Design goal:
2 copies of one chain form a homodimer.
Chain A lengths: L4 E9 L2 E8 L5 E5 L2 H14 L4 E4 L8 H10 L2 E4 L2 H11 L5 H14 L10 H12 L1
Parallel strand pairs in A: 1-4, 4-5
Antiparallel strand pairs in A: 1-2, 2-3
The complex binds the ligand Cc1ccc2oc(C#Cc3cccc(C(=O)NCCN4CCN(C(=O)c5cccc(C#Cc6oc7ccc(C)cc7c6CC(=O)O)c5)CC4)c3)c(CC(=O)O)c2c1.
The ligand Cc1ccc2oc(C#Cc3cccc(C(=O)NCCN4CCN(C(=O)c5cccc(C#Cc6oc7ccc(C)cc7c6CC(=O)O)c5)CC4)c3)c(CC(=O)O)c2c1 sits at the interface of chains B and A.
Organism (chain B): Human immunodeficiency virus type 1
Subcellular location (chain B): Host cell membrane; Host cytoplasm; Host nucleus; Virion
Protein name (chain B): Gag-Pol polyprotein
């Protein structure tokens, strides 16, 4: 388990690259449409917001990025080794913005607020706060 | 000045804007470097995706002259109230302390937000205040 474990990825749409982070214990995500310095910033933003102790990615691309290695060193983040749902909502909302950016962040909003349990139970937004909260 | 109640307002350095959302109860803050209500409407919708944002307070009229902002607030259920019931100072201080450690301004900004939100012997952090507030409720 843990409060500050996260997973990292890139997904793609419109020829644009959607940087996406998940909280693994909650499923809470934060995305951006964005290279190596955007992601550092991303990570830096994330890290001042949540406890971020460890970030897993699937490829080797991040182990090789100067700005990211320095972001993680400043913020105290270990990098370690080891979407299709998001894209559905962007669909339902894509016409509702001229910008793919705006569409990525409505679906984040929907993903995070809707009920995990579908009807009862918490949403991902509530959980990452509960988990964390439970911790202290 | 309590539940999902944030203050929003601007500050400037090195010829730029920094939007600054302040969660009134915790002292928690987010920030973004921006070209001045298109870009302002992206920061509220992400926020509202991170947290519970019901009322946004501004102490000027700019926010209301922007349909993109107004569009974002209606989508999210954010109440745009007028009237904000010196953080920028503190933060600009910290930015002040750290600017040389990164290249673009937006990095040191995010570094300043990090320090403001995680640093309290003291007792609790702005970042810990907001998580608890939101838990209880
Ligand atoms: C209903 C409704 C509601 C809301 C709506 O909103 C819109 C819209 C729009 C719009 C359009 C254009 C632009 C924008 C806008 O606001 N852009 C700015 C935001 N930006 C975020 C994303 N970022 C970036 O990653 C970025 C860029 C440059 C550099 C970096 C970095 C870094 C960095 O980190 C570090 C951390 C640690 C260490 C040790 C070093 C480093 C370094 C290295 C360094 O030292 O350098 C990051 C830069 C800043 C918004 C619509 C319209 C529509 O679609 O219908 C709409 C409709």
């Amino acid at each position: 388990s843990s409060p500050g474990i996260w997973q990292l990825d890139c997904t793609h749409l419109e020829g644009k690259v959607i940087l996406v982070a998940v909280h693994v214990a909650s499923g809470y995500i934060e995305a951006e449409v964005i290279t190596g310095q955007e992601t550092a910033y991303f990570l830096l933003k994330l890290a001042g917001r949540w406890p971020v102790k460890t970030v897993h990615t699937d490829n080797g691309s991040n182990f090789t990025s100067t700005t990211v290695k320095a972001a993680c060193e400043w913020a105290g983040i270990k990098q370690e080794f080891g979407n299709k749902e998001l894209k559905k909502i962007i669909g339902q909302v894509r016409d509702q913005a001229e910008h793919l950016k705006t569409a990525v962040q409505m679906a984040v909003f929907i993903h995070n607020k809707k009920r995990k349990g579908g009807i009862g139970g918490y949403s991902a937004g509530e959980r990452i706060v509960d988990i964390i909260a439970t911790d202290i």
